[PDB]
Short mmCIF file of C-alpha atoms in Angstrom, two decimals:
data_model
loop_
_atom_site.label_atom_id
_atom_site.label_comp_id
_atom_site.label_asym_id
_atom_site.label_seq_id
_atom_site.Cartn_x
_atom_site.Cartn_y
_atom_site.Cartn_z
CA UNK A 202 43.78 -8.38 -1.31
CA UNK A 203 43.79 -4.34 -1.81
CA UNK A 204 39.77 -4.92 -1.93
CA UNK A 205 39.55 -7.13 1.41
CA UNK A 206 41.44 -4.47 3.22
CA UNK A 207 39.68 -1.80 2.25
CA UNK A 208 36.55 -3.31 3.00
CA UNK A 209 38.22 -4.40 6.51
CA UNK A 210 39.72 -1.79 7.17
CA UNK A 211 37.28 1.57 6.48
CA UNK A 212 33.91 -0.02 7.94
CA UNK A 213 31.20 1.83 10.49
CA UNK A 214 30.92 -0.95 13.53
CA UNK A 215 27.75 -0.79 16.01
CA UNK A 216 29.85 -1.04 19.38
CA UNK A 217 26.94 -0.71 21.98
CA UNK A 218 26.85 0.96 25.32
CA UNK A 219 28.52 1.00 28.68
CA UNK A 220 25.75 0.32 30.59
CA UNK A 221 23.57 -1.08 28.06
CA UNK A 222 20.38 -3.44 28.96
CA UNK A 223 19.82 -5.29 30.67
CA UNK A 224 22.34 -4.10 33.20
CA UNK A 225 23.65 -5.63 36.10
CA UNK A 226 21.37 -4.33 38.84
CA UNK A 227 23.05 -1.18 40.79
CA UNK A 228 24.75 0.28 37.43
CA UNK A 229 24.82 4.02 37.33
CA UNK A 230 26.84 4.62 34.10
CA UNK A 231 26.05 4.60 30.99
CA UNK A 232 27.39 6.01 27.40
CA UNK A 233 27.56 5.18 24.03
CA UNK A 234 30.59 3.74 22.20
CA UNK A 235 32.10 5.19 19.21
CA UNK A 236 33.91 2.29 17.87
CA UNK A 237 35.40 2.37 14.10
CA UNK A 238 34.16 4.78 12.13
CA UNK A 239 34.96 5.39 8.18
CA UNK A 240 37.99 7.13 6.99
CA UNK A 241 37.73 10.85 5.92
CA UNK A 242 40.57 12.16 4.38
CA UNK A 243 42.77 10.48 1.58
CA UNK A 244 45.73 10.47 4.69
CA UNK A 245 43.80 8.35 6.41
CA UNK A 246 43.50 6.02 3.01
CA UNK A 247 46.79 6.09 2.15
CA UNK A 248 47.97 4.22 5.93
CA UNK A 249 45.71 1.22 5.37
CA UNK A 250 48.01 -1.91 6.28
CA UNK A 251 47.93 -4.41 3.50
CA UNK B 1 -43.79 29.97 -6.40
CA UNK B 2 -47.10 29.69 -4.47
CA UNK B 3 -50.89 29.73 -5.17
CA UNK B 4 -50.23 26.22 -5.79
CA UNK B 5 -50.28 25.03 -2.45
CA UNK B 6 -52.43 26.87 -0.41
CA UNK B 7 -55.73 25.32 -2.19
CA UNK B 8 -53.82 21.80 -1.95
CA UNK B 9 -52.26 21.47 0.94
CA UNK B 10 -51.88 17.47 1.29
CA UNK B 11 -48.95 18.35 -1.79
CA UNK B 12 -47.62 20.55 0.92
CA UNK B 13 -48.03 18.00 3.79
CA UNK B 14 -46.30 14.82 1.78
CA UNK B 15 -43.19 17.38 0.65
CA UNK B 16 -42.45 18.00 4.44
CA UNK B 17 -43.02 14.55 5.63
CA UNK B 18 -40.76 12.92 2.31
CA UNK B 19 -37.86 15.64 3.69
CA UNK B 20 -38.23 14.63 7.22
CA UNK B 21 -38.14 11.20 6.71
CA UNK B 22 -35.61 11.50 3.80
CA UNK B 23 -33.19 12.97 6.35
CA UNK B 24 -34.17 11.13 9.01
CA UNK B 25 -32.73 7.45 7.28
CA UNK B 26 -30.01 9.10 6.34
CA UNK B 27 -28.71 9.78 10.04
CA UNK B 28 -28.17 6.47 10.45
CA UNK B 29 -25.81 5.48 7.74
CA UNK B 30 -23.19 8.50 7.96
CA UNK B 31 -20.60 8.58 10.76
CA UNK B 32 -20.61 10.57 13.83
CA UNK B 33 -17.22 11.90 15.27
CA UNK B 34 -15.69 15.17 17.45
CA UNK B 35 -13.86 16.88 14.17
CA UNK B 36 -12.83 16.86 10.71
CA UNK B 37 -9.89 16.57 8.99
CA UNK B 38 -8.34 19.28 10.67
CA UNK B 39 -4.95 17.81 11.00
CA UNK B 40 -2.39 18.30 7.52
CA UNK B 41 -1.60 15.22 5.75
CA UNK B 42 1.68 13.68 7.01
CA UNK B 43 4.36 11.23 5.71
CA UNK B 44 6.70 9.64 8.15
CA UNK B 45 9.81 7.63 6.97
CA UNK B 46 11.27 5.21 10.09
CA UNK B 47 14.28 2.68 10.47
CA UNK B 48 15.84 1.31 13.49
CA UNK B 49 19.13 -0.20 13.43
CA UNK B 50 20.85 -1.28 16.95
CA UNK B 51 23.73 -0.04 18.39
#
């Protein structure tokens, strides 16, 4: 269970854009999303909800 | 040297004619481009992974 957190909780996730393609048409924004990213610190760690 | 070739000039004759027409086969069996090699040698390493 310790290992299935971990590995669901500290993961790099591929989240897209805002006005990715192929857009609606008239769409003037668009920007990257930075979804989860991996933890850093051993804080970070140490909060992981089991 | 010479001496050899001014009394026998048909030796003379048949060693310009066999490098004539030993260079002028071998035009046609070498490629023909702008330039060499000029450009270094290059390695390029690629991945793509979406979004």
């Amino acid at each position: 269970d310790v290992s299935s957190a971990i590995q669901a909780q500290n993961v790099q996730i591929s989240s897209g854009q805002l006005g990715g393609l192929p857009a609606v048409k008239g769409q003037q924004l668009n920007a990257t999303i930075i979804g989860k990213t991996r933890l850093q610190t051993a804080e970070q760690f140490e909060n992981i909800l089991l | 040297m010479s001496k050899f070739f001014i009394d026998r000039p048909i030796f003379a004759w048949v060693i310009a004619l066999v490098i004539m027409l030993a260079g002028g086969l071998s035009i046609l069996s070498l490629p023909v481009n702008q330039y060499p090699a000029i450009a270094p040698p290059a390695i390029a390493v690629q991945v793509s992974y979406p979004g």
